[model samples]
Structures are given as structure tokens and as C-alpha cells.
Target chain A: VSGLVQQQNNILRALEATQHAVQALVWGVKQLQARVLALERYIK
Target chain B: VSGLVQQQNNILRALEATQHAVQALVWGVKQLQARVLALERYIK
Candidate 1:
């Protein structure tokens, strides 16, 4: 049915948004890792 | 119709897994943030 197809599309969109969020989180984690490493080096 | 339902269930499962991954990433980011803050304080 058309309605079912629309629902599926909505789910796909939500999944895409979640994927973007995960990517942003991944980037943030990497940045934090770098900062932490640099700080440790400075403290050493 | 049953096949379609199964497909939907599979998508839902994938979404659940993604949610878990996001939560883990959030936790990791918080820990990293704390560590970075402590390092900064030590350097000060």
C-alpha cells in the first residue's frame, strides 16, 4: 500500500538522520582523543 | 505481507543497534571530555 511505502520512507529518513548523528559523534570523539593526547604530551 | 513485516522488523532491529552504538559513543565522549578537563586542570 502507498501508506506502507510512505512509512518505510519515513523510517529510512530517520535512519539517515541517525547515521549523520553517529558520524558527528565519531568526529567529536576523534577530536577529543587528539586533544587529550596533546595535553598528556604537554604534561609529560 | 508477512515478508514485508519481516523486512520492517529487520529495519527496526538495525535502528536499535544504531541507537546502542550512539549511546556508547555518547558515553565514550563524556569520559574523554572528563579526561581532557582533568589534563587541562593539571597543566594550569
Candidate 2:
């Protein structure tokens, strides 16, 4: 049915959004790690 | 077990992706916290 198809699309979109959010989270972690590591080496 | 089953599989995959993302986030936070604690100790 059309309604079911619509529901399916919504779920797929949500999945994509969640995946994108995770990507951003990973990028953020990488940036933070770089900064933290530099600070750590400097402190030592 | 056709359209609905396929959709279920997609959802499962998405869930796994989300789970992995959260794991990364948790690890990042732990690392950040550890670094912060070290700095705090050094300052004190």
C-alpha cells in the first residue's frame, strides 16, 4: 500500500540521518584527539 | 518474507550502525575525560 511505502521511506531516511550523525561524531572525535594528543606531548 | 523482511533487514543494519556510532562516542568521551583529569591533577 501507499501508506506502507511511505513508512518505509521514512525509516530509510531516519537510518541515513542517524548514519550521518555518527559520521559527524567520528569527525569530531578525530579533531578532539588531535588536539588532546598535542597537548599531551607538550605537557610531557 | 519479501518486502517486509527486506525492510526489517535494513532496519537491523541501521541499528548496528547506530550502535557502533555510540560506541565510538563513548570511547571519545572517555579519552577526553582522562586527558582532562590529567590536566587537573597537573594544575593542582
In candidate 2, what are the lDDT values of residues B1-44, reduced to their tens digit? 56889888878888897998799799888989899789879968
lDDT of 2 by residue, A1-44 (tens): 46989888888888889889888988988898888888888889
Clashing pairs in 1: none
Over 4 Å off in model 1, which ranges?
none
Give a tens-digit lDDT track for model 1, residues B1-44: 56898878878887988889888997897888788788868868
Alpha-carbon shift of residue A35 in model 1 (angstroms): 2.1
Model 2 chain A, TM-score vs. native: 0.88
Assess the local accuracy of residue A31 in candidate 1 as a C-alpha lDDT between 0 and 100: 87
> For all the candidates, what are their Cα RMSDs to the real structure?
2.3, 2.0
